[PDB]
Amino acid sequence: DWRCARSMHEFSAKDIDGHMVNLDKYRGFVCIVTNVASQCGATEVNYTQLVDLHARYAECGLRILAFPCNQFGKQEPGSNEEIKEFAAGYNVKFDMFSKICVNGDDAHPLWKWMKIQPKGKGILGNAIKWNFTKFLIDKNGCVVKRYGPMEEPLVIEKDLPHYF
Structure with missing residues (x-):
């Protein structure tokens, strides 16, 4: 039961x-988990700053899990292969996942x-x-904070020292 998971x-x-x-491979690491899209007004700032944070903090154990999702204005319409190539254009070295839903009955658990x-x-409400x-x-794999779509990734930086 996904609701009973502890981590x-x-x-x-x-x-x-x-x-x-x-995802047990992330035990011992602080992670940012985010839903991404390629055709969003915030695509450039989010990819640029996630890559920046990952570069500057990997030595501290920062990992980033990016889940493509087409549920918001159909702004991630491409194939997984196309999305991987798109992320390569931003020099992404963090972890890209296959496209999922984040809301609704078919959302990834x-x-x-x-x-x-x-x-x-x-x-x-808790919907994305x-x-x-x-x-x-x-x-330990526990959620410690949530940041909205308009909060650029650099806003997270001041919170990282509480979890490294």
């Missing part, structure tokens, strides 16, 4: 190449779970509101 580490997800990833964590609460929502995950 992100209990979940698995397909990477953007189609291979299953056990990790996203169902994050949305009902105590610190994953949304505003006027738009592209580039972010969840901060601590080293």
